[PDB]
UniProtKB/Swiss-Prot annotation:
It comes from Arabidopsis thaliana (Mouse-ear cress). Essential protein. Functions as a histidine kinase and transmits the stress signal to a downstream MAPK cascade. This protein undergoes an ATP-dependent autophosphorylation at a conserved histidine residue in the kinase core, and a phosphoryl group is then transferred to a conserved aspartate residue in the receiver domain. Required for the development of megagametophyte in female gametophyte (embryo sac) independently of cytokinin. Disruption phenotype: Cannot be transmitted through the female germ line. Impaired megagametogenesis visible from the four-nucleate stage, with two normal nuclei and two degenerated nuclei, leading to female sterility. Normal response to cytokinins. Residues 14-145 form the Response regulatory domain. It comes from the Eukaryota. This is Histidine kinase CKI1. The chain holds residues 979 to 1118 of 1122 of the full protein. The gene is CKI1. It is found in: Cell membrane. Expressed in vascular tissues of inflorescence stems and floral organs, especially in procambium cells, and in siliques. Homodimer. Interacts with AHP2 and AHP3. The modification 4-aspartylphosphate is found at D77.
């Protein structure tokens, strides 16, 4: 848990889980479901998250959707081959400019960040940081809200 400078807890929410590890992804997904999340989407890479976010935002804009964000929260694995979570977050924030929106993006890591990673968390534009146990998932969301 930290911010970056029960079975209905997330009812009504739509979440994207982005993780290169299939078991991690399945574990994040099930924890979110046990919180009453209405919709979890999963993908296995930074480039796929970017695609799903860029399409979802264009769609809702074109349709004049009441909700403009395709996902209420994104859980973004930090270390991934090719496009890591910092780079994906960064590009999503570039894409969101045109729309005047901002999706809550939560960095997920199996260790505490070092100073280089910490610097990246902020420059990428992440809102928060969580350990992969997801023990603090709810406090962080309360904190972001
Ligand atoms: Mg990883």
């Amino acid at each position: 848990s930290g911010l970056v400078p029960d079975d209905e807890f997330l009812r009504g929410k739509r979440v994207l889980v982005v993780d290169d590890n299939f078991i991690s992804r399945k574990v994040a997904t099930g924890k979110l479901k046990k919180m009453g999340v209405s919709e979890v989407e999963q993908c296995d890479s930074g480039k796929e998250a970017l695609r799903l976010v860029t399409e979802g935002l264009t769609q809702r804009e074109e349709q004049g959707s009441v909700d403009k964000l395709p996902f209420d929260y994104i859980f973004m694995d930090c270390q991934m081959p090719e496009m890591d979570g910092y780079e994906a977050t960064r590009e999503i924030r570039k894409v969101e400019k045109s729309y005047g929106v901002r999706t809550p993006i939560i960095a997920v890591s199996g260790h505490d960040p070092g100073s280089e990673e910490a610097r990246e968390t902020i420059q990428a534009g992440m809102d928060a940081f969580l350990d992969k146990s997801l023990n603090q998932l709810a406090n962080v969301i309360r904190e972001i809200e």
